[PDB]
Amino acid sequence: MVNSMVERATSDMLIGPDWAMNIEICDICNHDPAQAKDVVKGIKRRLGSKNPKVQLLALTLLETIVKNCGDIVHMHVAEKDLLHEMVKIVKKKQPDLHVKEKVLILIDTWQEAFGGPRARYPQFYGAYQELLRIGAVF
Amino acid sequence: VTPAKLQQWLDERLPAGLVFKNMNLDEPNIFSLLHEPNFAKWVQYADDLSAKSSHKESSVISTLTSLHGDKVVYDTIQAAKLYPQLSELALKLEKDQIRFWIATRKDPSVVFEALNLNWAGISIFPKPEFSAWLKYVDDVNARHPKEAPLSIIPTLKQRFSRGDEAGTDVLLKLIANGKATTEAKTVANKVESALFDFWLNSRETPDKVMDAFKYGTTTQAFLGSPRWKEWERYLSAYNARYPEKKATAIETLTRKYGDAQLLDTLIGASSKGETKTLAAKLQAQQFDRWMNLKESPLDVYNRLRSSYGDTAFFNEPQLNVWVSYMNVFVDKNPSKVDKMFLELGDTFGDMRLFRVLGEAKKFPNLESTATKLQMEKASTLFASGKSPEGIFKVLALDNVGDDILSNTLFHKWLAYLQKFNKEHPNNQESWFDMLRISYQPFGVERIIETGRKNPLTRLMAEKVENAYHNYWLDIKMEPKTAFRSLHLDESGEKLLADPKFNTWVQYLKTFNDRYPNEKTTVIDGLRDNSHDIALLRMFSAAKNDPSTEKLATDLQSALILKWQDAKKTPEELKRVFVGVPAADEMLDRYIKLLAVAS
């Protein structure tokens, strides 16, 4: 089902992100919150790929759905510890530099956007503070 | 799979890209893809989906560009236009791709590349694709008024050279020749406006921007160019946008290069016709700055010592310009003119002061008070009873130049020399020697030429001319050498008509009188400097001038005498001449003389 969309939207066969496909996914997430669960779960899996291109595509999709779709997805993202995996990407000895830059920008955006420690999903801020403890800078 | 499955999927709002892959539209070749009828059905799906998706724009394009990159898509659509049954679709696709690009704020560089503006180089402006590219930029900005605007300029710079300044140089060239043709002129003006806006929006200072206009050239050359005015136009534009940071040209120039180099450049520019006008203007403004800062001339000297021209301050030209500031300074401060020069006097050695004062006399504001102190100092020096040699140097007479014979100090110094020489009969000094040493032979020569031309100096100039020739006697300069010394070698056919020829004859005589043992004839002197055939060409010419005719004939005889002394055979002479004026006359004469001798 939905996993197919995610996989294709994050396939190594793309040279660039299919933004229209990303938006189309956003639309269905606004229609069907059940499907939205499955989307974010798929993204986690694809982030788990070795391939930095796949990772970038996944990050870019994630950026899109986060900005576009409703609170359910935000809840899923936090609750499925997706953030923890993202942290773990940065924790690599030799991470990809573009990936690293992308995650940093995203997490900085989000912890601000959600209101930091008083965020109803404080996980965003938690991840950001973990990063700060290692001495990362955007 | 079926239209039913598609309608199902449409109800389910499946993403276009997934449907593509479900359709196995992963064809191996992009150019093939558009021929599959299946692809068209997918287009319809994608359109119908777009009608109820959030995005207006063509998901198709998004899909395809995401697989292949923008250029490849565009080129593929252009390839699709060929087959006319695909034409209607291909033109829809082109429109859609544009819509897509505009919506997605795609970077102008990608559009430029996709348009194959690779080609144009010289002729970017007339080409319709380039026009379309500007249209794209304007359209994008129109759709996106909230965002910071996009610009052409980075694309252009980065393409033509990998250097901020250097790329901009070619752009400026292209703008300039675009303006000249009526065809490109409109386009050229838009490009210019964009470049300007780019600098303004990037807040690039006039100082920085100047480096662009200066590129390729010497500092000097930039000022002579059209580009100077163009950069002034930028400066004025910059000041308008950011009046809190307002700057004028000279201020800007000062802060970029510092006063010393600026001054040096203004000196250079003031010498040359192209720049002279504004060199002077900018120079005056530089003075005006120092005046508004209430900097005394000596304060200004302090400032400027500390880089370039201190070692090269006291010489021409730098000094002259300093004195020009002094003139202006006293025009604003007449009261303190005495105090100024007095301070110079205690600060510097007398010879330096003299050097100043010589120049100061040229300037009306200074002339009187300068003349006064010049004489006061001079009088003191005369009263000392020191050597004329020493005094000459202290008076800076070595740096008066060609018109020294007009100079009041030089005359006063002569008077001292004569008094001194009477009072020191055992230890006399030569005026001429001082002139010779200090101005070198070539300077002496110019001095004579200058002093002859002015009637007031003429007698003095004759005295000097004599002394120079006397020196030639004292050093035993051979008349052969003296001929070249007077550049008689240059006078060509007309040598005998040359006034200086006569002078050289008279020197040669005087030399013979001093040195009878090595006595030399005019004709021998002529023979040393040139060969017979040139000489009788000159003689045949000289016979045409009555004033020289007699001379010519005498020399013809004197030449013949030398052939006799040389024991030359007429055959040798006949052989070596061919088609030569007066040859046969002179041969026949020599032949006749040979007969009488035989």
Residue numbers in the entry:
A (entry chain C): 1 to 138
B (entry chain A): 78 to 675
Q: What does the published report state?
A:
We previously reported that the potato late blight pathogen, *Phytophthora infestans* deploys an effector AVRcap1b which can also suppress immune signaling and cell death mediated by NbNRC2 and NbNRC3. The 678 amino acid effector AVRcap1b is a core *P. infestans* effector in the RXLR-LWY family. NbTOL9a belongs to the Target of Myb 1-like (TOL) family of proteins, which are presumed to function as ubiquitinated cargo adaptors in the endosomal sorting complex required for transport (ESCRT) vesicle trafficking pathway. We found that AVRcap1b suppresses immunity by bridging the activated form of the helper NLR NbNRC2 and the host ESCRT pathway protein NbTOL9a.
To structurally characterize AVRcap1b and define its interface with NbTOL9a, we crystallized the mature AVRcap1b protein (amino acids 62-678) in complex with NbTOL9a^ENTH^. The structure includes the full ENTH domain of NbTOL9a and residues 78 to 675 of AVRcap1b, spanning most of the WY1 domain and the entirety of LWY2 through LWY7, with the exception of the final three residues of LWY7. The crystal structure revealed that AVRcap1b binds the ENTH domain of NbTOL9a via its WY1 and LWY2 regions and adopts a previously uncharacterized L-shaped fold (**[Fig fig2]**). Comparisons with PSR2 indicate that the bend in AVRcap1b arises from the LWY5 domain, which introduces a 77° angle in the protein backbone, producing the L-shaped conformation (**[Fig figs2]**). From LWY2, S139 and S143 (both from α1) also contribute to the interaction. The R90E variant which exhibited weak association to NbTOL9a was still capable of suppressing NbNRC2-mediated cell, although not to the same extent as WT AVRcap1b (**[Fig fig5]** and **[Fig fig5]**). These results indicate that AVRcap1b binding to NbTOL9a is required for full suppression of NbNRC2-mediated immunity and confirm the functional relevance of the interaction surface identified in the co-crystal structure.
